[PDB]
Amino acid sequence: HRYRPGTVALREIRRYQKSTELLIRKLPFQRLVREIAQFKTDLRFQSSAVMALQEASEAYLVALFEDTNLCAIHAKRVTIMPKDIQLARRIRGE
């Protein structure tokens, strides 16, 4: 048995819009932050700082992807493409 392409996609869309948990794994994100924080060598961090960074990053990515989807739909496409992101960031003023 197989679910037709896109059905499980909608199922995931629903379930992940219902849920409120984080999507990015904490350890990779912490390693990324502590790597790109090397600005000032030998730094120390409060955990809440990394949690707020993760929250803000996931929120920003979600907000960006929403406009990406809007653009792709405007282009009469289902699949999003990098040009859609570029257009979104161009109009957004970045």
Binding site: E12, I13, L43, R44, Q46, A52, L53, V62
Partner: protein, 78 residues
């Protein structure tokens, strides 16, 4: 090279939360670049605040102040 730790399943889940049905294969690098730029800006501001404060440890309030500086205004961390 820890930017590769933002895995394809993670980006796909974020997109799903965004309401995307079909994802191209080239989205992930662009997403990685954008995330890197955003994190770099915020972290630069946070480190600036920390250095001015004469602190070794970067506090959460500093992250909040940077986000407020850039116009995000995160709630829930004081």
């Amino acid at each position: 090279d820890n930017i590769q730790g933002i895995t394809k399943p993670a980006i796909r889940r974020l997109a799903r939360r965004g309401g995307v049905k079909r994802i191209s294969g080239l989205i992930y690098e662009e997403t990685r670049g954008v995330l890197k730029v955003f994190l770099e800006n915020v972290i630069r501001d946070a480190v600036t605040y920390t250095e001015h404060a004469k602190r070794k440890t970067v506090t959460a309030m500093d992250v909040v102040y940077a986000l407020k500086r850039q116009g995000r205004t995160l709630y829930g961390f004081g």
